[PDB]
Amino acid sequence: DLVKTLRMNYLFDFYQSLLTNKQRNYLELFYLEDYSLSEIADTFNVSRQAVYDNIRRTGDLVEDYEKKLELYQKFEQRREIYDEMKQHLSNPEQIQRYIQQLEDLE
Amino acid sequence: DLVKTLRMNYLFDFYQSLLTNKQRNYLELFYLEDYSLSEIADTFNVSRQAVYDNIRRTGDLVEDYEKKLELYQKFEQRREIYDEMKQHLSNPEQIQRYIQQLEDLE
Known part of the structure; x- marks a missing residue:
């Protein structure tokens, strides 16, 4: 499922400006700061499920941008x-x- | 305006894949093919006003992509x-x- 890879660091670097502040913050915490889903859920006081769907969806959006723009x-x-x-x-x-x-x- | 028209012609190939079908077709017709708003509205059987608003938002969006990604x-x-x-x-x-x-x- 969610995997912390080199690829995700680069996709974020290339496409971060295209996201909203909230989308960026979810990926900054998970992929850049290496927080776990539980640590983010506690930071935002939201459910783990909510954190997971937010990161999953935003990650899919960044992959969508890469398929279209091919910057990486x-x-x-x-x-x-x-x-x-x-x-x-x-x-x-x-x-x-x-x-x-x-x-x-x- | 002329400047927006020239810019849409330079930037289209870099960012067209990010646009929706409607945004893409209207931008092509107005800026790349020189159709008037009324002609576009008649081509797709839609509101001339909706077309104007869509093109205005799209033109701004494309320049914003260039400000953010600088691909051109x-x-x-x-x-x-x-x-x-x-x-x-x-x-x-x-x-x-x-x-x-x-x-x-x-």
């Missing part, structure tokens, strides 16, 4: 390309083809 | 750096600096 998938491929380019700084042909790949993934 | 601005900055790199393919130190510039953008 594009960032991941660019990061891989930058690392490879940093291994071929002295080869014009390699750099040229990596620039092409950076343009094509857009 | 960043795509164009990356485009310029890629083009600058193409002019220094034999300068290892310079290429390394451009990659640093790109990493600072993300």
Whole structure:
């Protein structure tokens, strides 16, 4: 069900501005601050079920944004390309083809 | 206005997937295809006023997405750096600096 993964930290970083303050605060507490559902429920004095549905729904919204905008998938491929380019700084042909790949993934 | 029209044309490809079907179709017709409000209202058999209100909210929404995510601005900055790199393919130190510039953008 809910899993604290690297992916969720990145999706939040990319899409947090698109959320409401309440949606952001639920994900900040759970994923960024590593609170448990019970700790959040006690902080907001709401039921655990309520906390779970709020985090589940908001997480699904962020995944929906990623499917539409693909910012994390594009960032991941660019990061891989930058690392490879940093291994071929002295080869014009390699750099040229990596620039092409950076343009094509857009 | 002209400026809003130009902006909707630059920003549409980056954010159209976030819009509802109605928001997307009305924005396409008004800003990309130059239909009048009455023509759009007749095309979809709806209130000219509802169309005006929808387009007004949508135009503001799209500019707000660019203010928050900067996808068009960043795509164009990356485009310029890629083009600058193409002019220094034999300068290892310079290429390394451009990659640093790109990493600072993300």
